[PDB]
Each structure stands twice: as structure tokens, then as C-alpha cells.
Design a protein around this nucleic acid. Structure first.
Lengths: 170, 159, 293, 205, 56
RNA sequence: GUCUACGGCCAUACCACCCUGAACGCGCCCGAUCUCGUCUGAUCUCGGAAGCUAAGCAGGGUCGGGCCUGGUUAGUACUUGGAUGGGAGACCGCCUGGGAAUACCGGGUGCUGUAGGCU
RNA sequence: GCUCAGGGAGGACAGAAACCUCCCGUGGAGCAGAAGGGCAAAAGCUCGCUUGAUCUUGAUUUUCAGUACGAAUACAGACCGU
RNA sequence: UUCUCAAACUUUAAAUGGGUAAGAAGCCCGGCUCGCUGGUGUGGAGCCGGGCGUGGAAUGCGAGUGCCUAGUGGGCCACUUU
């Protein structure tokens, strides 16, 4: 009997559309997430001026959206079906999280538009556990402890169990 | 000539000790200072407000004035041949009590114990701190065994 | 392979924060303002009303800071409240009020200011302030220690504040953070605050589940069904409590029963044992070779 | 080129290192502070011989460089390329100043950096040579050749230590036997009774 | 025509001729520099000592 | 035996990892109707009590790192005062008093105030 | 209300460097400038409201002759902000 | 792990040094005053009136105080530090 407070689940689904572009592209990039999640995404600014990339400091580069709960589950099913439920070893972080990109947002269930167009976006799933909200209280905060961590090994056998998904090398 | 300037040569004086940086422990802020309380001055760097001048660091005065956050303290700074008892307004955190006076105020009361006791009983007690006398004659025993002979050790270079 | 941040040199140089900062409890920035007195008061005790809402309890203490550690002059916990009427929902705004009220009335009993400074007898919800009466002892003036709680409009700390303010404590405050403060056009609808004090925030939500689906009602309100609390009962259930608190606020202590003295805690392993374990281990290792090789 | 070592012999000034403040410092002539077979194990070069200062004075980088060469040559002529290992245990960190008089005078006379010099104390090691125990008389002669390249008085001591370690030569084999010492290049790592016991199990595995 | 810039050479000898006088530490020091709001009240406390003369 | 609320002193308390937690507590945990706050009821705020000590927390462990405290280093280094002492100097010795710091080797590993529990 | 420099591990385009999370992070960043000191639920970062950078007596500190100036520190009386 | 360093580096850290204290202006009860401070003849200060002289480390030495005031305001040398 595993203690039912060790039930590994999805804390959040960190979506981002980083275009490296302002105004019309970036506002019509936000259309994709808002037609997908049903919530208004935040426009992340540039950290500083990289002249090589064609950005400038505080110029809006990207648009991103974190999703919690049933909505976070339901979107992540649409994402993995485009990757036909297979991910690489090196896609899974040492901290027990995983992520993967998609080439184009049409594959999820949004239809092609002349104005909205095509936008590749980026799934990052943040796997957690009951008692991971200790690390961001205002009152008595604390680290989760070495036992209660998700390992990359534990995160791989979660994906393999939950979504019946094979994990492949390369 | 030197740079005249209020905090000149106070690189180490007004610095905090090693791993005693950060928040001021709050017992500092909640000890009562009266008039005539003998007080030693030691500029804490964490509180830049109401600091004493570097010349009053490691000096001991008595308090004449008590305000909200600070005490006016009379201290003997000496200029040339003149010693000038002068009045500086120092905040609490640059000030402790002085335990210098507090070993006398026990001796006052201890003398009051030994005086009222045998004011009538007629055993004349000693109330003056007589200096450390020449140690009185005594017998050093060598319990059977001899004292160990010492001889100077011969020279041999080490490096 | 990159440079380890937690070397010897890290831990040598490392300065620990204060225990109560390490534990994530005390704000020493905000404490230094609230606790310490002006030097020209000289052990005039500076009281503060310490409201601490737990997961299951509301702790309302009054302390003044002495150098040895601040000394609690009167305590009122919300788990006392069944002896005054309130059975269940011990960590809501209405219990916060009762906890705050019980603290005030209990303290004014111990200073012999029970008859003087009655406070709000009939609970209104408006801004009350306990004025001092001439020829009498002055009103007990303490301040509000909110702790770490994000003081939003309608935080439960401001329940116990109002609870104690109505109970005959002079505490400086504003209605801005009482529930019923219109944030938009900047007025204070006092009727909304009376709802929360008399627990109609809960009673309206009880009815909302009770009328939609009994599945969600039983799960949410299991011990309201159990201890026979209906939404129609709610307002009088606190009026009875508010009056019963004021009748007899004094604290009969729980009598310390004879302890058989057994040690549930593991004792500290002595030097001889620790020194001998590593002797047994380095014997166990060498006869795991002599048997092997 | 540069003045006699009579001018910059005695530790006259405070130590004046190449730093953020003293910049524009010329490059010291000594750079190779150890040579021979400096890729040698403790076990094979027991006999260490120290040249030791007997005077509190400044020894030039150019003198250290000369004495480094003078000892290396004679050690190669005696013990061969890889029958010894020299360490010059002084590093020229004190900067020497020159007041170039080309019509200014003693006005604004603070010197520009001329060179570097090793500040040496009484009973400090200038150079040291570890080699095989047979090559004892060759070490004494190699360091005596190199004494003439320094001012003041140097003594030539034969260490009661094993090579360039800090452990006595009548103690060394007894401490490598019980694995209190393990060889780790030219040095030897001391292993106390103080680590975690998993460290100890790797010792006696 | 450069000259000597500063010295403190004969000064310690000059200071000690007429002694180094510790200040004339007289009893009852002045109430100059004591906070006004407190010094106001103390003056009122002296003003009304006549009131409790019979009681005293 | 021990916790909670608020502390005082701020590592003997930290840090890493493991082990055990009776009861009360403290928590994670269940929700968003109200007050409040968000991209997101995760945080914040609020209303609860199905579930579990997994975690935080407490105690314990480790020839643990660190820290605290002694020993050694060492009467060493440096040093007040002294000499028509030595030495070409560099510097050194002695007399008169004072007197350190690593490496190295031990030991220790939070005390504790007010209020309120629990056993 | 937040935590920084920097590092590790991941993630469509994306590379040494854009963005997104999780972890380590005693300050190694930042605080206009010189350097020093000070600083982590802050003194930094981001927001909210503001004009205590206002009006007024004295005392004091610093340089010092114990004179000015500048700068400063503790109060007191107002009126104010938060 | 190892070699070697720092006037503008430092965990430690001297010797010499610099404050202060070593009583009657002290101690000790008791009452009075206050517009200051206040849960509270609370807190603090200020006043009166009593009672306590084994004069509270060594050594030496009579001190205190105020006017008027010349010359000087090129210095130089020595031990140790620099």
C-alpha cells in the first residue's frame, strides 16, 4: 500500500508561443492559446536587447499560459496524440518534470484561418504531488524533502502508466 | 593633508562583525536608559541614523537626555590639553549599558550587608579592597618522588 | 561537472537567519515597529493584540515585550467556544469575532474594568471606538499584530479586531479592511459586515448547496448536519454566543492530571555507544573479508 | 639595463604586489618554479635537500631564474634528465620601483615598476631538490653552485622529511603501511580517523 | 623656500605643564538640551509644589 | 515526555541524507458561494473536515560537512621597557614584563521566557 | 507583494546567447556616481497612493579657535502623506 | 591535495594603548507635585523631611578660581615605528 498522499499528478501545463516579434503577430499568437485554454494569456517582455535575434529590451517577445486541473489534463491529451504518445529520454528533466514541442497548433483541434495562420507552441508539464505547495506559502515555508521529490525515473514510469506511452532513446 | 570627513577610517570600526550582519536583535531596542545611566558608545553600521562620531566610538559617558529613539549622553572627548565633557545625541543601537559601574553598586550593597551585620556584634569587617598581597609562607610537599631535573635541549635546525 | 555552490567555504561564511525567520513565522521588520516602546516611556508596557488564524483554530493573545521574551497577559482560543455556544465552524469570520470578543471581555474582567467599558452590547457593524471615561481608569489601548497574513479587504484578523473593539478594547483601525468595504466607489456598507459577524456569509452558502445538490452540501457541511446547525438557526446561534461570552468570560483552567511519565521521544545516543558502533562496523567489515577471502 | 641588486637588497618598503593599484608591471624572469621529473611518485624520491635563507632580504626574480638554471644543469650532469625534481619555493611578488632621471629632480619622485623581487625571511626555503637517496652529495653541490647567484648568506639543509611532503622520513613508510598516507602525485594525502565510514571502507576494500 | 608642514612634537609636553584639566564637574548640571515637552512638565511640577505644602 | 501561540539569545539551532513519530496540536489536504486576489482558487483571500503522516514539523542517527568549545601549535611568532650587548651591514642574542593564529587531535550538537494544551 | 547575480536540468522554431517551467542559489547582484561601510519577507525588484524636499523656535554633532559656512543628529510646536 | 603571497585582502588576533568606574552629589525608607506618560497614586521626573560616617583600592601631593600679559608662530637632532 503506497500512502495516497504520494499520488503523482500534473501541477500545471506551462504553454508558451515565443515568436520573437511584436504587435500583430504576437496579439494573433495570443488568439491560439485563448482559443485553446479559455483564459487570457500574459505577454512576457524581453529581458534585454539581443541585436542578433532582432529583439530589444522590454519589447514583447512571447505569450505564455499556465493551466491547472481538469483543463490542464484535457489539453495535454490533445498534445500527446500529435506525438502519438511517444517522447524521448532527454525530454524528461532531472527534477521529475517533462516537456515537448508541437510544430503547428492546427493538430490540436483549431481550424486554419487566413488572419490567425500557423503558430508552433511548446508544452511543459510540471509533475507534482500532495505537499508541493509548502515551497510557496507566506507562513511556514519549507523544502519538500528528499523522499517526496519526483525523480526522472519516477516521472518516466508515471507517463508509461498514465497515458500508456512508450519512451524511446536518441 | 588627510580628507576631513565624518566616516573616514571607519572601514572596520562601523562595520558589523563576521556572521553578525543583517537584522538588529530586538533586546537592543527594549532596555531602559535613565538619567545618570553610565553607557558605552559603539557605532553599529546597520542603523546609519543617529550614529555617534568615530571619536566617541569606544568611549563611556552618562545619559542626561532621553527622547523617543535616542539618548543625549555626556562624554569626555579630549582636544589637545583640554578635556571637554560634551553632549552627543546617539540612537539606542550605538549604545549598551556599562558593567563598569555595576561591579561597584554590588560592592556598595555588599558593604551594606557586612556593615549593618556586626554594627552591634562587634566583629570589625574589612570594607576596603586591599591590593593582592605577597603570598603568605607555606609548605610545598614532594610526596616521596624527587622533582624532575630539566636540562636545556640541544640545537637542531628544522627547515 | 560544475563548481559545487555548497562547499566548506559556503558553510564557513554562511550566517543563519533568526530561528523565527528560519521557521518562517515572525516578520522582524514589522515586529521592531509593533513591539518596542519609546525610550522616554521607560517600561510603560506596549501591548499588541496577536490574532493567529490556524487551519482549525483562531488564537487571539495580548502580549507586551520584555527582554526575556514577550509575556502573554491574556489568551482566547476559538476551540473554547463550544462552552459559550458555537459548536462548529471555529475558523470562520463569525468565530474570529467571538474569539476577539472573548479576549476583550476576559482581559477587562482581570483589570477590574468589567462594568466600565461594556463596548457594543447590541452588535451593529459600524465603526465603534472605546472612548476613555473621566474619573475612571482609562481604556485598554493595544495595537493589531496581523502577523504575515496579506491584509486584504475582509481578512479574518480584522474580524477579531472588530470582535475586541466591540468588546471594550481601544485598538486604532479603519473600516477599509472590514468585509463590506466597497473598493470601487470607496464607501463602507456596514450591513455586509454584520452578515459576516453574524455568519450569514456561510448560511447563504449552506442554502446555495442545500437547494442545488445535497451531494456537495454533505461533503462541504458534514459537521453542520452532525451538530444540528441549520442556516435559519445561524444568526441567533452567534447572538446567544456573543451574550454568553460577556456573562462569564473568565477562564477555568483544565486540571493537570497525574502523568505516569513514559518517554515517547528517543533519547540522545551517548559517546560510548557512537564510538562503539563504528568499532562494531569496522569489525563487521573485516570478518566480511576473512569469511569472503 | 637594470640597476645592481645592492640597490634593492633589503626589505626596505612594505610589500608592494602586482595588483589593481600597481599596474604596468614588467614580466618576472622566473616562470618555471619546478622542473626535473616533477611527474614523480613520493615513494621513489625520498631524499629532499633545502637551500635556506639566513638573512631577511629581497632576492631578485633574475637571481632566482639564474640559480634555478645553475642547479638544473649540474643535476642533469649528475643525476640525468629524470633523476631529480627541483622546486623554487619563492615567487617574486614584491614590485621594485625606478625613479628614471632621463630635468624634474626629487619633485614628484614615485617610481614606475622596474622589476619584481622575492621577499625572503631568516629560515625560509629558497629552492629544494628531491631525488634518490644515493644522490645526496650531488644535491648539496647543486645548491652550493646556486648559492653564488644570491646575495647574503644561504645554508644547505638536508630534510628529515620524505621528499616535498610535511611527514618525517623515519615515519613515512609506517604511515603508508596503515594507509594514513596514500600517494597522489608528488604529494601524499593525509587520511584521518574523522571522515564518513564509507570513505574508510574504500581504504580497506 | 619649502618649510616644515605639520608636527605635534612639543605639544604633549606643553599640554601637561598646567595639567590636562578634567572639566569642573559641578553638582546640579544645567537642563540645557533636555527635551522641551519633558522640561515644560518638570517646570509645571515645580510651579504647583505650593499646592501640597500642608499635606507634606 | 512533548507540542502550539508569541518570543529572548541567534548554527551546540545550519546543511545533507536516513530513521521514528502515542495523544493533543500543527499541517498537507476538500472546495470557491461569500470577502479578496489572480494568465491560472498554485500563491493570496475565503468556506470546510472525506483522507493521510507522504511531506513540512518534532526527535534520533552519521568514525557526516559546518558550527561551538578546549588541546596542540607555543612560551613559538610578535611585543612594553633596558644596555658604551653582538654584527661592516642585514639582522640577531640577552635582561625586564606581556603573549598570539592555522595545519593537527579531542569533546559538544540548541538553551529558554510568558500563555495555553496533550500524555 | 516579490527575490537577486550566477549555475544545473528540461522544453516547437531556438543555436553560446529570445522565451517557458522546476531545482540549487549568504547576496557572490542591485542600491545614479568614486571607494568604503551597510542591506534579503530589505535599503534591492515590481506596483499602489503621495509631496516630511513643506511651516517654525531653540539644543547638539562634524571641521573647530571649540568661530563661521556647508553637511549632519536628536527633540519640540504646527500642518500633512502613507 | 600542494608551492608561494597582499599598504589600499581577511576568518582569527596580540604587546603597547584609549574610555569609564572605585560612594555622603552616596545608599536608604517615607510623603508631596506634574498640564509629561497612562489599563492601573502605572511610568518617569521634580520637590520636601527623616535615618545611615568602618570616608569604602595602592602611592604621592594643599588646592580652587579670575583678570592683565610678553615673547613665539624659520627649528634641528637621537632610540623605536614610518
Amino acid at each position: 500500500k503506497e500512502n495516497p498522499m504520494r499520488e503523482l499528478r500534473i501541477r500545471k501545463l506551462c504553454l508558451n508561443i515565443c515568436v520573437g516579434e511584436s504587435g500583430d503577430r504576437l496579439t494573433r499568437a495570443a488568439k491560439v492559446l485563448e482559443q485553446l485554454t479559455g483564459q487570457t494569456p500574459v505577454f512576457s517582455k524581453a529581458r534585454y536587447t539581443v541585436r542578433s535575434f532582432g529583439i530589444r529590451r522590454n519589447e514583447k517577445i512571447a505569450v505564455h499560459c499556465t493551466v491547472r486541473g481538469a483543463k490542464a489534463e484535457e489539453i495535454l491529451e490533445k498534445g500527446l496524440k500529435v506525438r502519438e504518445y511517444e517522447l524521448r529520454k532527454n525530454n524528461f528533466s532531472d527534477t521529475g518534470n517533462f516537456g515537448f514541442g508541437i510544430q503547428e497548433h492546427i493538430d490540436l483541434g483549431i481550424k486554419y484561418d487566413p488572419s490567425i495562420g500557423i503558430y508552433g507552441l511548446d508544452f511543459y508539464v510540471v509533475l507534482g504531488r500532495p505537499g508541493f505547495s509548502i515551497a510557496d506559502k507566506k507562513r511556514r515555508t519549507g523544502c519538500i524533502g528528499a523522499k517526496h521529490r519526483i525523480s526522472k525515473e519516477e516521472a518516466m514510469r508515471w507517463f508509461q502508466q498514465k497515458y500508456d506511452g512508450i519512451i524511446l532513446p536518441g | 593633508t588627510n580628507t576631513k570627513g565624518k566616516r573616514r577610517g571607519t572601514r572596520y570600526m562601523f562595520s558589523r562583525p563576521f556572521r553578525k550582519h543583517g537584522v538588529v536583535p530586538l533586546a537592543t531596542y527594549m532596555r531602559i536608559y535613565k538619567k545618570g545611566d553610565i553607557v558605552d558608545i559603539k557605532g553599529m553600521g546597520t542603523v546609519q541614523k543617529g550614529m555617534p562620531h568615530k571619536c566617541y566610538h569606544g568611549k563611556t559617558g552618562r545619559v542626561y537626555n532621553v527622547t523617543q529613539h535616542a539618548v543625549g549622553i555626556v562624554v569626555n572627548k579630549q582636544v589637545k590639553g583640554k578635556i571637554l565633557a560634551k553632549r552627543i545625541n546617539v540612537r539606542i543601537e550605538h549604545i549598551k549599558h556599562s558593567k563598569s559601574r555595576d561591579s561597584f553598586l554590588k560592592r556598595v550593597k555588599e558593604n551594606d550587608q557586612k556593615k549593618k551585620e556586626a554594627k552591634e556584634k562587634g566583629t570589625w569587617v574589612q570594607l576596603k579592597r586591599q591590593p593582592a598581597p605577597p603570598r603568605e609562607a607555606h609548605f610545598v610537599r614532594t610526596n616521596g618522588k624527587e622533582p624532575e631535573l630539566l636540562e636545556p635541549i640541544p640545537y637542531e635546525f628544522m627547515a | 561537472f560544475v563548481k559545487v555552490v555548497k562547499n566548506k567555504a559556503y558553510f564557513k561564511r554562511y550566517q543563519v537567519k533568526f530561528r523565527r525567520r528560519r521557521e518562517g513565522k515572525t516578520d522582524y521588520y514589522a515586529r521592531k515597529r509593533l513591539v518596542i516602546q519609546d525610550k522616554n516611556k521607560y517600561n510603560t508596557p506596549k501591548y499588541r493584540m496577536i490574532v493567529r488564524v490556524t487551519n482549525r483554530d483562531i488564537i487571539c493573545q495580548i502580549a507586551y515585550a520584555r527582554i526575556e521574551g514577550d509575556m502573554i497577559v491574556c489568551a482566547a482560543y476559538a476551540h473554547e467556544l463550544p462552552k459559550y455556544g458555537v459548536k462548529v465552524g471555529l475558523t470562520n469570520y463569525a468565530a474570529a469575532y467571538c474569539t476577539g470578543l472573548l479576549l476583550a471581555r476576559r482581559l477587562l474582567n482581570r483589570f477590574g474594568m468589567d462594568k466600565i467599558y461594556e463596548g457594543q452590547v447590541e452588535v451593529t457593524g459600524d465603526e465603534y471606538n472605546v472612548e476613555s471615561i473621566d474619573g475612571q481608569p482609562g481604556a485598554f489601548t493595544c495595537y493589531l499584530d496581523a502577523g504575515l497574513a496579506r491584509t486584504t479587504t475582509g481578512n479574518k484578523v480584522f474580524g477579531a479586531l472588530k470582535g475586541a473593539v466591540d468588546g471594550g478594547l481601544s485598538i486604532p483601525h479603519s473600516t477599509k479592511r472590514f468585509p463590506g468595504y466597497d473598493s470601487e466607489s470607496k464607501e463602507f456598507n456596514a450591513e455586509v459586515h454584520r452578515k459576516h459577524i453574524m455568519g450569514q456569509n456561510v448560511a447563504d452558502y449552506m442554502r446555495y448547496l442545500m437547494e442545488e445538490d445535497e451531494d456537495a452540501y454533505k461533503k462541504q457541511f458534514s459537521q453542520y448536519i452532525k451538530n444540528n446547525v441549520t442556516p435559519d438557526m445561524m444568526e441567533e446561534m452567534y447572538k446567544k454566543a456573543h451574550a454568553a461570552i460577556r456573562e462569564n468570560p473568565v477562564y477555568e483552567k483544565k486540571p493537570k492530571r497525574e502523568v505516569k511519565k513514559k518517554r515517547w521521544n528517543r533519547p540522545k545516543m551517548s559517546l560510548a555507544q557512537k564510538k562503539d558502533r563504528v568499532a562494531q562496523k569496522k569489525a563487521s567489515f573485516l570478518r566480511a573479508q576473512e569469511r569472503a577471502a | 639595463g637594470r640597476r645592481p641588486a645592492r640597490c634593492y637588497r633589503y626589505c626596505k618598503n612594505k610589500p608592494y604586489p602586482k595588483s589593481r593599484f600597481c599596474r604596468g608591471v614588467p614580466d618576472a624572469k622566473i616562470r618555471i618554479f619546478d622542473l626535473g621529473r616533477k611527474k614523480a611518485k613520493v615513494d621513489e624520491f625520498p631524499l629532499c635537500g633545502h637551500m635556506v635563507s639566513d638573512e631577511y632580504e629581497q632576492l631578485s626574480s633574475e637571481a632566482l631564474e639564474a640559480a634555478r638554471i645553475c642547479a638544473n644543469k649540474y643535476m642533469v650532469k649528475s643525476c640525468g634528465k629524470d633523476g631529480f625534481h627541483i622546486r623554487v619555493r619563492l615567487h617574486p611578488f614584491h614590485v621594485i620601483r625606478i625613479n628614471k632621471m632621463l630635468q624634474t629632480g626629487m619633485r614628484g619622485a614615485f617610481g614606475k615598476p622596474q622589476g619584481t623581487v622575492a621577499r625572503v625571511h631568516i629560515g625560509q626555503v629558497i629552492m629544494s631538490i628531491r631525488t634518490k637517496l644515493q644522490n645526496k652529495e650531488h644535491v648539496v653541490e647543486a645548491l652550493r653552485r646556486a648559492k653564488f647567484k644570491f646575495p647574503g648568506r644561504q645554508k644547505i639543509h638536508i630534510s628529515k622529511k620524505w621528499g616535498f611532503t610535511k611527514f618525517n622520513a623515519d615515519e613515512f613508510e609506517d604511515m603508508v603501511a596503515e594507509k594514513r598516507l596514500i600517494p597522489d602525485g608528488c604529494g601524499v594525502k593525509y587520511i584521518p580517523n574523522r571522515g564518513p565510514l564509507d570513505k574508510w571502507r574504500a581504504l580497506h576494500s | 623656500a619649502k618649510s616644515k608642514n605639520h608636527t605635534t612634537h612639543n605639544q604633549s609636553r606643553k599640554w601637561h605643564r598646567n595639567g590636562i584639566k578634567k572639566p569642573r564637574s559641578q553638582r546640579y548640571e544645567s537642563l540645557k538640551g533636555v527635551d522641551p515637552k519633558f522640561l515644560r512638565n518638570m517646570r509645571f511640577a515645580k510651579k504647583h509644589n505650593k499646592k501640597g505644602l500642608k499635606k507634606m
